[PDB]
Amino acid sequence: TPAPDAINDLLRSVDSQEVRDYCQKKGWIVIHPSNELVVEKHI
């Protein structure tokens, strides 16, 4: 398990869906399910 700042440097430099999926498989990044996020609207 690398350091968070390492994950960050990798994704910043080489970002792709493939690299994201890999990071996700390894559990280096964990997706926030969008249905659990509170969304607010304002005018």
Partner 1 sequence: MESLPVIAAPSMWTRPQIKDFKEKIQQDADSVITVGRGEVVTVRVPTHEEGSYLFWEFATDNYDIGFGVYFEWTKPLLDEIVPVYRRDCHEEVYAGSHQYPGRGVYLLKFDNSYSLWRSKSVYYRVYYTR
Q: Report the residue numbers after which the chain has a gap, meaning the C atom sits over 2.5 angstroms from the next written residue's N, or none.
A: none
Residue 30 makes contact with partner 1 by CB under 8 A: yes
Instruction: Determine, following the binding rule CB under 8 A, whether residue 25 of this chain makes contact with partner 1.
Output: no
The answer to whether residue 10 forms part of the interface with partner 1 (CB under 8 A) is no
By CB under 8 A, tell whether 16 contacts partner 1.
Answer: yes
Q: Are 16 and 24 in contact (CB under 8 A)?
A: no
Total residues found in the chain within this entry: 43
Binding residues for partner 1, rule: CB under 8 A, are: 1, 4-5, 7-8, 11-12, 15-17, 20, 24, 28-32, 34-35, 37-43
